[PDB]
Design a binder for this molecule. Structure first.
Ligand SMILES: NC(=O)CC[C@H](N)C(=O)O
Length: 235
């Protein structure tokens, strides 16, 4: 009757907190709208990103809505709803930096990634092994802070989150994307979705039906235009 939804609230404009601590963003909007149509009450539960899937398995939450990319490896552990939106990854660095998302360019440099994320996996496999100082952070706010402090040369995260939550904000005015999106289907998955226990067939079916329903009547686009002047859903 209650659905507990875990989210990492340091990933604007998808999941973050306003000045009085209330959860805000597109993930929150999608979650609340789906639960409205499911006719369920929903409790939001703030969590570090890397604790979300462990908390879901332990039954401390019932769903994850936290820009959780749908990947082959994660599907071995949990189930996913249908796609909520697309999520490409992209590097950011200081404006005018020559940095590229390449080993040759990042060797010896300090690159921040969120612990537990697809970006940490990609960076650990392709960069950390090979001499890039990949630094793994409990949350994304610590990454932005350490980047602006000049402790990081660059940071890898979801492209829309970096753009709307940092680059277009006053904090990130002197920073820019370094190179194009990092395209690696294996690592970064096929968009984001609601993360669910594999046996929670009924819950997944309910989320899927509300999501189709709010996409069909135009509610998705209404909510998306609050944050985005582009097609965040993808293909
Ligand atoms: N909330 C997030 O930081 C999610 C990051 C990334 N899309 C992942 O799934 O790993």
């Amino acid at each position: 009757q209650t659905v507990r939804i875990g989210t990492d609230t340091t990933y604007a404009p998808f999941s973050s907190k306003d000045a009085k601590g209330e959860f805000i963003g597109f993930d929150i909007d999608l979650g609340n709208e789906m639960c409205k149509r499911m006719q369920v009450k929903c409790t939001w539960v703030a969590s570090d990103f890397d604790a979300l899937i462990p908390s879901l398995k332990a039954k401390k939450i019932d769903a994850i809505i936290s820009s959780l990319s749908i990947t082959d490896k994660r599907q071995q552990e949990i189930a996913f709803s249908d796609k909520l939106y697309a999520a490409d990854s992209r590097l950011i660095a200081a404006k005018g930096s020559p940095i590229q998302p390449t080993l040759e360019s990042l060797k010896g440099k300090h690159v921040g990634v969120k612990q537990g994320s697809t970006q940490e996996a990609y960076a650990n496999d392709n960069w950390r092994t090979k001499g890039v100082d990949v630094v793994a952070y409990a949350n994304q706010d610590l990454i932005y802070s350490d980047l602006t402090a000049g402790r990081l040369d660059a940071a890898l995260q979801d492209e829309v989150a970096a753009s709307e939550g940092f680059l277009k904000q006053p904090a990130g005015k002197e920073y820019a994307f370094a190179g194009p999106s990092v395209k690696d289907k294996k690592y970064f998955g096929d968009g984001t979705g609601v993360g669910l226990r594999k046996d929670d067939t009924e819950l997944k079916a309910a989320f899927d039906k509300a999501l189709t329903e709010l996409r069909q009547d135009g509610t998705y686009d209404k909510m998306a235009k609050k944050y985005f002047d582009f097609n965040v859903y993808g293909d």
